[PDB]
Amino acid sequence: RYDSRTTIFSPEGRLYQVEYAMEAIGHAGTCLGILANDGVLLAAERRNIHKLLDEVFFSEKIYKLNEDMACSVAGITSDANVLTNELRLIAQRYLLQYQEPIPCEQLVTALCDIKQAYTQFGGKRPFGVSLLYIGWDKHYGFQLYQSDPSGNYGGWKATCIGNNSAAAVSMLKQDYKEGEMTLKSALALAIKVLNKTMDVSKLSAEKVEIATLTRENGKTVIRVLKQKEVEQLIKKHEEEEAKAEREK
Amino acid sequence: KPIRALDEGDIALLKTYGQSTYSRQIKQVEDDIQQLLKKINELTGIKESDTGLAPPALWDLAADKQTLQSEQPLQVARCTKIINADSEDPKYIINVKQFAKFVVDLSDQVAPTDIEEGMRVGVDRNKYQIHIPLPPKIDPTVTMMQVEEKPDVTYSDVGGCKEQIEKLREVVETPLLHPERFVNLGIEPPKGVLLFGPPGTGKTLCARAVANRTDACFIRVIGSELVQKYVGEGARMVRELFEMARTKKACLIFFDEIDAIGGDNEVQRTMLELINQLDGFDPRGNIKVLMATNRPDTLDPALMRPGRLDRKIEFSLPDLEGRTHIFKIHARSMSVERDIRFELLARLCPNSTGAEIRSVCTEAGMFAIRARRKIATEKDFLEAVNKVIKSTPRYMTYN
Amino acid sequence: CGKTMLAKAVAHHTTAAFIRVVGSEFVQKYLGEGPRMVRDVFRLAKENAPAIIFIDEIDAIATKRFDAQTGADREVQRILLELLNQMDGFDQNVNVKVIMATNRADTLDPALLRPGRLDRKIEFPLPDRRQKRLIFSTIT
Amino acid sequence: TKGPDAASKLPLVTPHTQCRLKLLKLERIKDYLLMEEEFIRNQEQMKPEERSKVDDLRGTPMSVGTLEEIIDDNHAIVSTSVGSEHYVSILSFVDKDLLEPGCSVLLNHKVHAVIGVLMDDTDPLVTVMKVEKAPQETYADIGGLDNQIQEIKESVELPLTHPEYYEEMGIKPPKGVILYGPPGTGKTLLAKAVANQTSATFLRVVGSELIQKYLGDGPKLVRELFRVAEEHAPSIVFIDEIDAIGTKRYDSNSGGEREIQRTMLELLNQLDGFDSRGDVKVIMATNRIETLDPALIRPGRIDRKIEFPLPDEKTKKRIFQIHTSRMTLADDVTLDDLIMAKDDLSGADIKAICTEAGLMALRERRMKVTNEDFKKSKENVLYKGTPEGLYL
Amino acid sequence: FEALGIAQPKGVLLYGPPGTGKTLLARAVAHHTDCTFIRVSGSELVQKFIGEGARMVRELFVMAREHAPSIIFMDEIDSIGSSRLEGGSGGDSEVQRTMLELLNQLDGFEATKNIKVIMATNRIDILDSALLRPGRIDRKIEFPPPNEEARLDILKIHSRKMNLTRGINLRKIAELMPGASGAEVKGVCTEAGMYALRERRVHVTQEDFEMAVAKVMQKDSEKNMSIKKLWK
Amino acid sequence: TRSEYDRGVNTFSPEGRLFQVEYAIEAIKLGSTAIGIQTSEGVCLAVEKRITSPLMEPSSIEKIVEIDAHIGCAMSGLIADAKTLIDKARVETQNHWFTYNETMTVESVTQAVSNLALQFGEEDADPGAMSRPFGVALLFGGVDEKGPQLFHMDPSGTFVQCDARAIGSASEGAQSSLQEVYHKSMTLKEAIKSSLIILKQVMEEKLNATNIELATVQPGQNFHMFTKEELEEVIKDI
Amino acid sequence: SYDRAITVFSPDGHLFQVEYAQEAVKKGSTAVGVRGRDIVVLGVEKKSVAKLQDERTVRKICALDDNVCMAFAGLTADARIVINRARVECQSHRLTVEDPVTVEYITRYIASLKQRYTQSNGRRPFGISALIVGFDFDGTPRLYQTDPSGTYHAWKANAIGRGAKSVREFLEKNYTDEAIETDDLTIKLVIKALLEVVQSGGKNIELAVMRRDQSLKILNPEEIEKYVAEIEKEKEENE
Numbered sequence A: 001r002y003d004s005r006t007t008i009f010s011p012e013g014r015l016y017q018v019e020y021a022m023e024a025i026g027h028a029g030t031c032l033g034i035l036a037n038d039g040v041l042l043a044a045e046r047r048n049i050h051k052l053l054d055e056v057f058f059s060e061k062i063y064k065l066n067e068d069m070a071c072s073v074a075g076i077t078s079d080a081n082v083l084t085n086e087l088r089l090i091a092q093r094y095l096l097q098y099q100e101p102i103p104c105e106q107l108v109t110a111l112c113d114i115k116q117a118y119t120q121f122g123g124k125r126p127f128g129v130s131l132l133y134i135g136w137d138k139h140y141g142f143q144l145y146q147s148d149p150s151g152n153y154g155g156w157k158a159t160c161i162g163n164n165s166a167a168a169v170s171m172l173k174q175d176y177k178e179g180e181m182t183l184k185s186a187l188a189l190a191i192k193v194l195n196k197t198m199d200v201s202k203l204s205a206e207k208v209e210i211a212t213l214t215r216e217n218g219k220t221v222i223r224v225l226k227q228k229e230v231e232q233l234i235k236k237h238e239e240e241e242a243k244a245e246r247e248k
Numbered sequence B: 001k002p003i004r005a006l007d008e009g010d011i012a013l014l015k016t017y018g019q020s021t022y023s024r025q026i027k028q029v030e031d032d033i034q035q036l037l038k039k040i041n042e043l044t045g046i047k048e049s050d051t052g053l054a055p056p057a058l059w060d061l062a063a064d065k066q067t068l069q070s071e072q073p074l075q076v077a078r079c080t081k082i083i084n085a086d087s088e089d090p091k092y093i094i095n096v097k098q099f100a101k102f103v104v105d106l107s108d109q110v111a112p113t114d115i116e117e118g119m120r121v122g123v124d125r126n127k128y129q130i131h132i133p134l135p136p137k138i139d140p141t142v143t144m145m146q147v148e149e150k151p152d153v154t155y156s157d158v159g160g161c162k163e164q165i166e167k168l169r170e171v172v173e174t175p176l177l178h179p180e181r182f183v184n185l186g187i188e189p190p191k192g193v194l195l196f197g198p199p200g201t202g203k204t205l206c207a208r209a210v211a212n213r214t215d216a217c218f219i220r221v222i223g224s225e226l227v228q229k230y231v232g233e234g235a236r237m238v239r240e241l242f243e244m245a246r247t248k249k250a251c252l253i254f255f256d257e258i259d260a261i262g263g264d265n266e267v268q269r270t271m272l273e274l275i276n277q278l279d280g281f282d283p284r285g286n287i288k289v290l291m292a293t294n295r296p297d298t299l300d301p302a303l304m305r306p307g308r309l310d311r312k313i314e315f316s317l318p319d320l321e322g323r324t325h326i327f328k329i330h331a332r333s334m335s336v337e338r339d340i341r342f343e344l345l346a347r348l349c350p351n352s353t354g355a356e357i358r359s360v361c362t363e364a365g366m367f368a369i370r371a372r373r374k375i376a377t378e379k380d381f382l383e384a385v386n387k388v389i390k391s392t393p394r395y396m397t398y399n
Numbered sequence C: 001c002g003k004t005m006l007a008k009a010v011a012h013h014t015t016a017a018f019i020r021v022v023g024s025e026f027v028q029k030y031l032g033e034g035p036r037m038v039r040d041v042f043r044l045a046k047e048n049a050p051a052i053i054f055i056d057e058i059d060a061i062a063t064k065r066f067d068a069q070t071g072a073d074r075e076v077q078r079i080l081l082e083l084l085n086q087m088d089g090f091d092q093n094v095n096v097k098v099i100m101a102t103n104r105a106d107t108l109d110p111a112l113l114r115p116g117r118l119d120r121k122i123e124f125p126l127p128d129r130r131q132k133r134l135i136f137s138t139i140t
Numbered sequence D: 001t002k003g004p005d006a007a008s009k010l011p012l013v014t015p016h017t018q019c020r021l022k023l024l025k026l027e028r029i030k031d032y033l034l035m036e037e038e039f040i041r042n043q044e045q046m047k048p049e050e051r052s053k054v055d056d057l058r059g060t061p062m063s064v065g066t067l068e069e070i071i072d073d074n075h076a077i078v079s080t081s082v083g084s085e086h087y088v089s090i091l092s093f094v095d096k097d098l099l100e101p102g103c104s105v106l107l108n109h110k111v112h113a114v115i116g117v118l119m120d121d122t123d124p125l126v127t128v129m130k131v132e133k134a135p136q137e138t139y140a141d142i143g144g145l146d147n148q149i150q151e152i153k154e155s156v157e158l159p160l161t162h163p164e165y166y167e168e169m170g171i172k173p174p175k176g177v178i179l180y181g182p183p184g185t186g187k188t189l190l191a192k193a194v195a196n197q198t199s200a201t202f203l204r205v206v207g208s209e210l211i212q213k214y215l216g217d218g219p220k221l222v223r224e225l226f227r228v229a230e231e232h233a234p235s236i237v238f239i240d241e242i243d244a245i246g247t248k249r250y251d252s253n254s255g256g257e258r259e260i261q262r263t264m265l266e267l268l269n270q271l272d273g274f275d276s277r278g279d280v281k282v283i284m285a286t287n288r289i290e291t292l293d294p295a296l297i298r299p300g301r302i303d304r305k306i307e308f309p310l311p312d313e314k315t316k317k318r319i320f321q322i323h324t325s326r327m328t329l330a331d332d333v334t335l336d337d338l339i340m341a342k343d344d345l346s347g348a349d350i351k352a353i354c355t356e357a358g359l360m361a362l363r364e365r366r367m368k369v370t371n372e373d374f375k376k377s378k379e380n381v382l383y384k385g386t387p388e389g390l391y392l
Numbered sequence E: 001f002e003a004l005g006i007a008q009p010k011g012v013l014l015y016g017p018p019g020t021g022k023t024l025l026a027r028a029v030a031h032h033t034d035c036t037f038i039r040v041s042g043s044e045l046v047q048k049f050i051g052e053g054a055r056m057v058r059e060l061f062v063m064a065r066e067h068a069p070s071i072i073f074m075d076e077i078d079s080i081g082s083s084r085l086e087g088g089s090g091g092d093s094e095v096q097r098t099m100l101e102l103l104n105q106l107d108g109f110e111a112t113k114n115i116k117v118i119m120a121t122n123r124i125d126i127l128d129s130a131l132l133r134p135g136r137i138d139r140k141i142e143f144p145p146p147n148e149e150a151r152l153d154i155l156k157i158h159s160r161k162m163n164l165t166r167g168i169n170l171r172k173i174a175e176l177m178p179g180a181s182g183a184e185v186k187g188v189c190t191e192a193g194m195y196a197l198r199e200r201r202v203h204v205t206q207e208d209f210e211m212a213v214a215k216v217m218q219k220d221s222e223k224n225m226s227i228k229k230l231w232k
Numbered sequence F: 001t002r003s004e005y006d007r008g009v010n011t012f013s014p015e016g017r018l019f020q021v022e023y024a025i026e027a028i029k030l031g032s033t034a035i036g037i038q039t040s041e042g043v044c045l046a047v048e049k050r051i052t053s054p055l056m057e058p059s060s061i062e063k064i065v066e067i068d069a070h071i072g073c074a075m076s077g078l079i080a081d082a083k084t085l086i087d088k089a090r091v092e093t094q095n096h097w098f099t100y101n102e103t104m105t106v107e108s109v110t111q112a113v114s115n116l117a118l119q120f121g122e123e124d125a126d127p128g129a130m131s132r133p134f135g136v137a138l139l140f141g142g143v144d145e146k147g148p149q150l151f152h153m154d155p156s157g158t159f160v161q162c163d164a165r166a167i168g169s170a171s172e173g174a175q176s177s178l179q180e181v182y183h184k185s186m187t188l189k190e191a192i193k194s195s196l197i198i199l200k201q202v203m204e205e206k207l208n209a210t211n212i213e214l215a216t217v218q219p220g221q222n223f224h225m226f227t228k229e230e231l232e233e234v235i236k237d238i
Numbered sequence G: 001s002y003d004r005a006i007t008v009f010s011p012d013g014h015l016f017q018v019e020y021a022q023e024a025v026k027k028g029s030t031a032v033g034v035r036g037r038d039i040v041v042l043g044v045e046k047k048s049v050a051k052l053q054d055e056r057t058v059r060k061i062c063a064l065d066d067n068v069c070m071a072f073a074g075l076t077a078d079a080r081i082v083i084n085r086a087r088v089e090c091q092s093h094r095l096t097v098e099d100p101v102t103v104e105y106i107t108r109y110i111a112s113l114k115q116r117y118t119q120s121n122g123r124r125p126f127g128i129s130a131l132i133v134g135f136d137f138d139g140t141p142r143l144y145q146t147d148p149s150g151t152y153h154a155w156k157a158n159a160i161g162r163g164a165k166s167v168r169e170f171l172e173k174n175y176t177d178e179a180i181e182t183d184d185l186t187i188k189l190v191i192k193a194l195l196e197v198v199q200s201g202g203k204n205i206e207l208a209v210m211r212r213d214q215s216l217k218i219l220n221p222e223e224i225e226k227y228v229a230e231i232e233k234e235k236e237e238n239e
Ligand SMILES: Nc1ncnc2c1ncn2[C@@H]1O[C@H](COP(=O)(O)OP(=O)(O)OP(=O)(O)O)[C@@H](O)[C@H]1O
Pocket: D141, D142, D143, D144, D145, D182, D183, D184, D185, D186, D187, D188, D189, D190, D285, D286, D287, D319, D322, D346, D347, D348, D349, D351, E103, E107, E108, E130, E133, E135
């Protein structure tokens, strides 16, 4: 059949290796990002915390790339690390060449060009990694982009990739009020999405990984939600859910 | 929004509400129509079969009563090994169709000489003794064994197989027409040839052409016939056809679709009988066998051994000149214009068998019929070859 | 580790009508004879008293269903499907307990490994410490 | 031979809009049916030696066998239905010229001498395989497939009607035609339409029906079917689902596979048996055309091959017009958004979409289907490609 | 249906994960119907004798037609009607003949009337396209694993005959079974009953249901953490 | 079993045949017919356009191209493969005009083009080159010191002097016709009439202005491609 | 067989990998370009964004230079790569010869790049088809279509992507000399060609127009509704 090296074309025109790289992301941890009026956030699931992981870390799924850049990863760990290192490399190369933080579109296109080159030629397996870039620029303010192992990308305001990503994005689009969400509403929506999309009746703060990017006073600050902060957020959501169910 | 089951009130309202005033009458009339049709079909019935009674001018009723009482019914059986009768063991194995096999004696009417292995023996119903041999009396005008004396197709009709037709000419004519040349060259005349090539190449037609030229009668035998119901006495079939060929003058035996026969108990009887009628029959006869099937290997290995079928003629898909000749041959029998570019059509159908060519001509005729024109045009042939052959890519990268 | 021995012991200490089959015995040469045998064995158990069906080496026929591409694989999956529909199909069985033993549970079809068909998947691990002592004492 | 015993074919009522004209036409048909039943019943009421002795000579009961050989004018080789065959006599009263290998001779129960011949023997299987009531579907009920309908009319209708063109051009009429395409395209509907408009005997066959358990019953059934078709000439044989027996020929090992191969070789032989000039045509339909034997579709056996592609946009809208021609649609239903959506909708899919839209309308306690009902129905009935984003 | 101008739907396919209610729904529709229900659960139409499956299909449909408007339940239709295999040799052909006879009976030349038919399977994707085709199978109903509310409803249905203790919260038990089929919920009820039985009691406590959920839903995970950490 | 020797160009058949090169040869039969005739007064090239759509711009379809003012080209095969071949031919002609400052003969032109061809099975392709045989047949015509000259180039890299050669989907029929209709002292005008006659006889569609591109090279004038009006004048006679 | 090898000729002389790459364009989205007396237009079928995708970065029509534009169909990533290479080559050609790149030159470069990507193993062919439009510096209307095979052709009004055959027949039946007399007539022609396949109108349609050297502005979503309203007005006018 036509399931050999990626540089092959099915008679119907499909790139089967690229398609398998697509469908492989469904095995990765669920991560989503939402665009709010005055902030952006990345919510990711810690699928593997058994009992004895040191948690010596800043974020596993979320990776900071530049003083204005942050992204979440979903795919094979090796390709994840390679893509993140290349992201840092290209961002700093743009900063050196132009003395300006790299735009989100430009960096995303650079990474996607690399990924396409990894499926265009050479007999090399495509990067089985899908990304969710978060950042700010003077060109378009706050932007969210969802990458793709095929080398495609798209500008989104709400997107979930990983396991159960289809249902998560479906309910998210069913429950997204564009242009009228602050950071708090976006955080609550992300918590509700993670509740509905993960296989736990009461998800813990350990399984949740949230990082928020916000531009304030001339500079953009990227911070991951501390343990106390994320615990307070999830408890606020569970009391909101309790209020909703008792009212019903 | 939960679906709500249609309540009885909703069912009642929805049924009547908006409806034709005539709708009730229409439905009743249609139902009555169906009931009336059923009633007619019930009251016609009982159509009389009227079995095959001849007019009373032919009924000798007393004689039929006497033949009913006297004439015994004999079951039909297939005989088998003679078990060395020689008047000391007058017994034979006979297989009474699906009933059973038995070992039976003769009858006073019959003699040992006309009973051997393999023919149809009429055994009785008590002792099962063979009471009359019933030769299949096949001589089959009701089925295959074409038995065509001088086929209408001639040397001009066959087109393209020039090398093939020349090899066939040699083998089945130079001994047949000039026996003295083979005699004075000290070589037995070619015992036969196996005409192998892809199906539809026309090997049958080329054989019939040489048959018409030799003025020797052409015998075509199918294999599926004696694979299907007429199995068993196929040995006697080929026995009697070879016999009548001996009675006949110079002949041309031709086995097509023989792959079915070659590819086996009664079948094995058929080819060992033809071994007896080819090796045992002197190879000097004028009953030359013309073997022909697509398969060059499925034939039993004991068949092409020397002293038997000696050469093989490899038919191949017609070339450009062959294809245009076939096109002209098939279009001669059609109402077309006189300026049809048959070379163009031959070019447009590469690697196309002769059957595909005749189908292309037929489709051109149908296309001409479609526009209700009595004469087929070149455009019709172009559309026909576009339809049959090929059952942007070749126009945008090649040029 | 004692599976077939426990089946033998159950057959010893039972007032039921015990039906012993091996999984491979179901697979027949003739087409449609395997599912027919499954139907007949379950019907025999049903029409009898409270009965027990023991199918040793169930994974011979109850391997996970896949896109069978040949007649033999289709027939084996047909045997498995007949087993499923006989165990928990349209017409339920009464007082018909079915025991099946296998070495590789993970290769069994998920439809076979669900409550209502296999309510209990009992693991028979290799003996540990105390179990080894008990086995040594009862054999010596 | 007796001519074509076509179907009943009650006259079609044209309005169909539940109006007075429909009532008039239906009442007229009912009136004619009543005067037919009156006549048949009253003529049943009004007005009331050698044959008995020949019946006595025949005896009781009389077995039915198939003639296979005739040695002399007073002896033949008949075969009972079981399979056994005997050398039997022919009594005088049996009309000889009717004796032809393959008939149905009437045999005495004891000493199975031929005492008569049965012109009509057709066994229950081949009898039900014959169409009696023409299907209500018609070419008007077929949307699109103009080329397909045109080809089928050229193949099984033009030789039946005025055929002078076929021999005027010198080409043979197309002996047999086969329809292929994805499931639900219209292969069986186009055969129903042919049966509705035919003037010849139509023989519907399931293909898998021809196969029979007992040895020799399959080829015998095929032979009887085509013998009826010829004897019922002109006739049309519709072997639907030919792939049930039309699969690739392979060497057989089991007895059942040998019998299947025997049945198909008999069918192929009898397809070769009749001349193309004969007024018996075969029509075969299948979804897996590629899995057929490349000898049943030989140009010398089945020249035509009518393709049934998934309907295009205009054919889709034609089918939608046909299946919504009996609905009480509103003025808002565009019906264009549905045929827009680049999907694999077929005629069956469009019909199911219409039915589901009607069911949505019923679900809203309304009998006027709207665009929203069609919208939900299309998603409801469509089951189950390229990842979104690769191909722009 | 007539006045609406639509054609009556004929067949429905009940597909979904095993143990969700497909055969249970067929049993219920058999219990609550005035039609002559027919159980022709799959692989019963597969006979050793040649061409007997197609004959059995024909007799089944002629009998269903002879009776009142009837319902035919083809349980585990995956068995006989799965997918026509190319060619023969090792490929299955007789079962394909039976399936094609069933297809023609369902929607062929004859257009059977009032012969509504129900089929069930766990693998709809492997079913043949000629069988899944609408007009032969409309309204392909999916049986997804129950959500929390449906799981609670199933628990309350299957705990109706038990002797529950005052203070039982079946809602918590339903929340403790993420993505659990209805069959597993019934198994949870049964195992809680058995935990009560082992201590020779008749009432069932919340702890019993908790251990029953733990036991029934116990499944083998990826023991090797290194394999599990391949993906981010 | 020819399949094992089918794959790859570096595999020898038991009969010693280069099957992939043979397939490249047969890939010419998918190109439109091109006819070139050699006469003492010059050489004429006639081709078949095979216009896919009346909307297409005819000038884009380049069956006949100019390698140099003194030489002409006709093509049949893959458009891409040809384009590379034509660019190499023009580059080599200009290289000769640079180094030797003379008009290089058409024989040397086809020699150089064949040198670019027949290089599929070579190790010099490391920087990047064709790993498969070129699938386009070349018809080279022009005038040189030996008078007018016509050369046909084989996808394998073989070239031969042909007095009248036809390549394309209809090489066999057009060549068979040219076999008996060609004559040595045939004039250029009657040669062009003969070429158009063969093209009309062999074309699938009727002969008009947009079905044929016509080129001619004579010792006096340079390479001339027949314009629309010249095509009408030469096609009204036929 | 002969299909899974880019540089292997089939027995009937076909490079089946190249044809498969060509066919992969048919799975894209329709894009029709028409050239007029003074205008060239690019009509494409825009995929309807569900609820969140930013249309600003789903660019289907892209400008290689100030004098050339192009619309692709068949693979977004390969399209992006060839777009970047095309603009890099346009800038490099303007560096080498200082005059703006003619449409023929950039089309030839794109075709040669795709060809060199379909002549060796380990290099998958660019599975897109491009419609190069623009004016040469002398002011002539030229439109070009590039095939994944690496070949290019001159078209007066061509369509690519899915349903390109139907739009092709529409243009064959409707491309007239007077139909391009004015810019509005060309716009009407291209809109009608698009609505032949994308029948909804309004949205799902993107147009870019090029008059004589003005740095084309893609028709923003304020007059596309106006232009389709004029189209409907004419449509009810003649019928
Ligand atoms: N062109 C059409 N116009 C109208 N209705 C159509 C058309 N094609 C199909 N249908 C509808 O589809 C239904 C089923 O089609 P049909 O029985 O002809 O399918 P088929 O192609 O023979 O399928 P299969 O080979 O899978 O049995 C018909 O009852 C009819 O209502």
